[PDB]
């Protein structure tokens, strides 16, 4: 199969505010794709969707063949062994320190011997970079090292599809670059196919091999970073550089601006 996951035509409603509509996406294996759009448009919802943790209203999301929804809710766990979200804010377990906070999926799945697992975790930590931070608690690390250790623990099981929920968000350019180098070197080293859903364009497009762009209720553009950078499309041209005013309104809708100053004009 050419792609790793095909979201054929998903419309997700989320009650009364229909989030997605007949959206179409195709993450290919080996390619570190990305999807970007307005902030809080619900793309994290799209991620948590590809994880089965929420079901689509009417659509076929096919991870590596079979459908995510058509799963045994334990067969779902079997296949989800081949995924790992990298949520922002770390999502480290506050109780166990990083070392154990990394080992968790191992001890959960592998039958690994104790001194073997210790070294594998002490190795993934150096991989991501915060090896010396094994003993430290998650409530003690920074906001960047938190995401980094979360990444390290996320690569365990070599998930072959590790999606990033806006990792470089609220991050200085040094940590931003550490992140954009880590998740690049990974795909360029492992066979991992990261799906970075984010909205920091000058950072994402640096490594994104095939990006998608979604307006409020659908995807509007995709392609390569270069073939996207040169897109002549208002909704797209706006987001791609923040012209701050276009088809997305800069001014919130209001009435006439005149009596607003002159009640009983």
């Amino acid at each position: 199969v050419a792609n790793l996951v095909d979201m054929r035509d998903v419309s997700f409603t989320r009650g009364n505010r229909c989030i997605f509509d007949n959206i179409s996406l195709t993450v290919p294996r080996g390619k570190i794709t990305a999807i970007m759009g307005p902030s809080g448009i619900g793309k994290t919802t799209l991620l948590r969707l590809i994880g089965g943790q929420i079901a689509p209203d009417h659509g076929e999301i096919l991870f590596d063949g079979e459908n995510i929804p058509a799963m045994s809710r334990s067969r779902l766990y079997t296949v989800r062994k081949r995924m790992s979200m990298l949520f922002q804010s770390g999502a480290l377990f506050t109780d166990m320190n990083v070392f154990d906070n990394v080992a968790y999926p191992l001890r959960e799945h592998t039958q690994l011997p104790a001194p073997l697992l210790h070294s594998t975790v002490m190795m993934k930590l150096e991989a991501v970079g915060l090896r010396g931070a094994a003993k430290l608690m998650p409530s003690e690390l920074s906001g960047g090292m938190a995401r980094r250790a979360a990444l390290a623990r996320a690569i365990a099981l070599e998930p072959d599809l590790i999606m990033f929920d806006e990792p470089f968000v609220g991050q200085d350019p040094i940590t931003m670059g550490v992140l954009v180098k880590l998740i690049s070197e990974l795909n360029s080293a492992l066979g991992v196919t990261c799906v970075v859903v984010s909205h920091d364009v000058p950072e994402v497009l640096s490594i994104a091999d095939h990006a998608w762009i979604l307006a409020d209720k659908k995807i509007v553009a995709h392609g390569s970073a270069q073939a996207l950078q040169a897109n002549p499309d208002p909704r797209v041209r706006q987001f791609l550089d923040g012209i701050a005013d276009g088809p997305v309104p800069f001014r919130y809708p209001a009435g006439d601006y005149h009596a607003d100053l002159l009640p009983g004009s």
């Binding site: 592998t110 011997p113 073997l116 594998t120 190795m123 993934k124 365990a156 070599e158």
Partner: protein, 94 residues
């Protein structure tokens, strides 16, 4: 899904998947596995995963434990790929 290893005198010929799962049946008797081993050739090793790297590292430690310069033959591109990724020093992998 499979793993099979033989001490061929000087060469430790293991072959298979070398992941966290198929790894246990080798990890125990590692001592006699590296009994009189001079080098290990990971030739018919289909793929390799992190746990496999860890165990191999321990095996190298043993190869040096009695005291012996070990080497790794038939190694894979992916192995040294991870070895760069995991930033493993070339005094423990060679």
């Amino acid at each position: 899904e499979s793993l099979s290893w033989m001490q061929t005198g000087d060469t430790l010929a293991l072959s298979g998947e070398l992941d966290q799962d198929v790894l246990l049946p080798l990890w125990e008797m590692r001592e006699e596995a590296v009994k009189g081993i001079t080098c290990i050739d990971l030739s018919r090793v289909s793929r390799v995963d992190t746990g496999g790297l860890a165990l191999l590292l321990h095996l190298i430690d043993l190869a040096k434990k009695q005291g012996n310069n070990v080497t790794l033959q038939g190694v894979n591109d992916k192995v040294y790929t991870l070895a760069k990724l995991y930033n493993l020093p070339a005094d423990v992998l060679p």
